[PDB]
């Protein structure tokens with residue numbers, strides 16, 4: 001069942017994607033995207049929202065950045081119901097951003113906050129989670145975070161009830177705050193808490209580490225610490241702000257402990273633990289395989305242009321990219337000065353797609369082997385399923401393949 005976390009067979013169905021690029025997706029200021037699935041190979045870049053009328057910048061079921069990062073620009077609000085995956089990280093800029101991930105957030109890279117940024121996650125996997133820049137950040141964990149490195153150097157990370165941290169090393173310094181509710185557990189290799197403002201406020205939490213380093217009059221309020229390796233203490237003279245309601249159980253009680261906390265320590269030379277790391281979800285395994293996405297979407301199978309799959313409320317284009325102007329030509333079928341008469345637009349192309357700056361409302365799908373670049377802002381994008389005659393065409397040419405994918409067991 002942990003193997004099936006965030007499994008979504010529509011990931012492999014390219015008729016469920018509103019935006020796809022085999023290179024980059026470059027947004028512009030004040031774009032609001034409502035989509036089902038979105039894929040990019042290289043980076044997806046947002047710009048700052050300084051005049052965005054929407055509740056959200058992007059609302060999606062799934063966002064996948066197979067060979068790139070996801071870059072925030074400022075005041076962007078992103079909601080991903082199922083999974084957000086990036087290879088190379090998630091980089092917050094500009095402050096005031098929000099990322100809401102309701103099942104799985106996974107990066108092979110660094111997730112880095114800027115200040116006044118919020119992440120609300122259920123399961124989170126990453127190489128490094130940086131809560132260091134600015135102040136008034138908030139990373140809330142509903143199930144777990146699993147990481148090689150967690151740096152908390154400002155406010156804050158909250159562990160909701162019964163959630164877990166799986167490290168990796170954890171380093172809290174400067175104004176770093178880790179707060180944790182009932183039933184929480186923290187596992188780490190190295191756990192370092194440095195200075196008089198570094199805080200763990202987790203009175204019901206058990207912390208397991210190999211090495212524990214405390215430098216200064218840290219603020220620790222926890223239930224139990226287990227240390228199987230070495231406890232290194234320095235600049236610790238009173239320990240007034242170290243509260244441990246059960247015990248610090250450790251392989252070797254360290255020398256020169258202040259007398260007022262000496263009581264806390266209990267020596268157990270055999271103390272040991274084996275961290276019960278979550279398995280990598282099957283969906284992530286499959287996304288990372290070289291079969292994805294080209295088993296199911298093959299833009300190189302576009303060997304002819306198809307320009308007559310149009311209807312009363314839509315225009316389509318399947319383009320080899322030989323004619324530069326065909327893409328401007330389809331976009332000009334939508335007058336931005338006439339809202340109620342908006343028609344749907346479906347573009348599938350071996351070229352990139354540069355969306356003209358006068359577009360302000362697009363319903364449909366944009367699928368490009370080159371980059372997808374919005375040359376303007378102040379635009380609302382909403383996914384609409386491709387018309388059936390277009391899907392049938394794409395399938396006939398094996399530009400897409402739809403397979404009866406099932407969750408593995």
Ligand SMILES: [Zn+2]
Pocket residue numbers: 361362363380381382
């Ligand atoms: Zn619309």
